């Protein structure tokens, strides 16, 4: 009961791929018979073909397939790729906005942590400069470092924990503790903002209140949504009319 593998007419797409890698296994470099390439297996992560020793049909979710659709289903990966994906599981390597910004509107549970992470990055900057909120800074590190210092970097762990719907909860717990410290600690209220447009000194806005206000992200000045969206930011109109009359 021998298998039939020799083929004068292999599949033309595979012949193109195997030949692109000089008929060499991508993992061990073994040079393979061009008439036998049906034996090789495609590693859905590295995008290359492998001999049946280097690739043994291990299954694994695929980074690109998680960042283009919300697709966590496992795919056949080479041994080298299963090993390496497992290694970088908790590494903050994947920048959702830089890779695919559209995913933020297809996944709600992901937009929720994006939003939760935007608040946490503003709360962190304030707690770094408020000497009374230093046990709240320690609670900010019960979660990975990068969730509260960057906004668009995820690891495979975070992407999965988001789909399992648990990453929002651990982050919502933190954007509340922080929101009540700022309501009650007026060393943080002192670093709040007054909208340069309307000047209403009765409504001190903070950058993490994204319901109320939109933050410039050149000046990081904070304005009401109502007052901004149209036109430019007044802060930079002066700051670069400053060097303007200096030069």
């Amino acid at each position: 009961n021998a298998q039939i593998i020799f083929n004068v007419h292999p599949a033309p797409t595979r012949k193109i791929a195997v030949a692109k890698q000089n008929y060499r296994c991508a993992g061990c470099g073994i040079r393979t018979d061009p008439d036998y390439i049906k034996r090789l297996r495609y590693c859905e992560y590295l995008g290359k073909y492998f001999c049946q020793c280097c690739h043994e049909n291990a299954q694994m979710a695929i980074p690109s397939r998680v960042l283009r659709k919300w697709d966590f289903s496992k795919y056949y990966v080479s041994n080298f790729s299963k090993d390496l994906l497992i290694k970088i599981w908790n590494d903050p390597l994947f920048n959702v906005q830089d890779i695919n910004s559209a995913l933020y509107r297809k996944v709600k549970l992901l937009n929720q942590v994006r939003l939760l992470r935007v608040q946490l990055c503003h709360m962190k900057n304030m707690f770094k400069t408020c000497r009374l909120a230093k046990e709240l800074l320690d609670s900010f590190d019960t979660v990975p470092g990068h969730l509260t210092e960057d906004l668009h970097l995820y690891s495979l762990n975070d992407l999965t924990a988001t789909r399992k719907g648990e990453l929002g909860p651990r982050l919502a717990e933190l954007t509340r503790a922080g929101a009540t410290h700022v309501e009650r600690c007026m060393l943080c209220q002192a670093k709040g903002f007054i909208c340069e447009f309307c000047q209403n000194e009765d409504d001190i806005i903070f950058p993490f209140e994204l319901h109320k206000c939109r933050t410039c992200e050149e000046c990081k000045a904070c304005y009401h949504k109502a007052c901004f969206k149209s036109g430019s930011c007044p802060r930079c109109e002066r700051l670069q009319a400053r060097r303007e009359a200096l030069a």
């Binding site: 304030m126 770094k128 060393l187 670093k191 709040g192 007054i194 000047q199 001190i204």
Partner: protein, 176 residues
Amino acid sequence: VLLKVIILGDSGVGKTSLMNQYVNKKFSNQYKATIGADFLTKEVMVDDRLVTMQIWDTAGLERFQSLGVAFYRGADCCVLVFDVTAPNTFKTLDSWRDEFLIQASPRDPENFPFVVLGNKIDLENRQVATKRAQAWCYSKNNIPYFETSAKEAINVEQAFQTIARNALKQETEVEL
């Protein structure tokens, strides 16, 4: 009666030290960059009347951005500190007044009390001339000028008594 005073000026000119010297008659030469705005309180008395100053020093380095400045509101007096030995910080004086009038926003901003402190007169590489800085303050609606040393307690008590006096005046008006 409670006065709010706000200390501005470039990093390392002596804001935290002038305020430590005034409130606590203390001075340490070890530099510790202030990262966030905070305050001290001194009680003084003017004319049988008890009054309490709340003096805010700022982060003159570059821990501004993303962080607001709502605490300027209700400022009864604003203090501008430059270094007499670093002539650039005397140059950025205009920049600090102009921005403060825009963030605190008082009625009649050009009759608003400013007090200018030329710090570090105890050192010997003094660059900015006294008659030059006296003139600049005469330009801006006649605002007081003090050459001070947090190190040697030179004109510190003088300056913060003028700040108290001028704040006290300012506070009793926007109640009118």
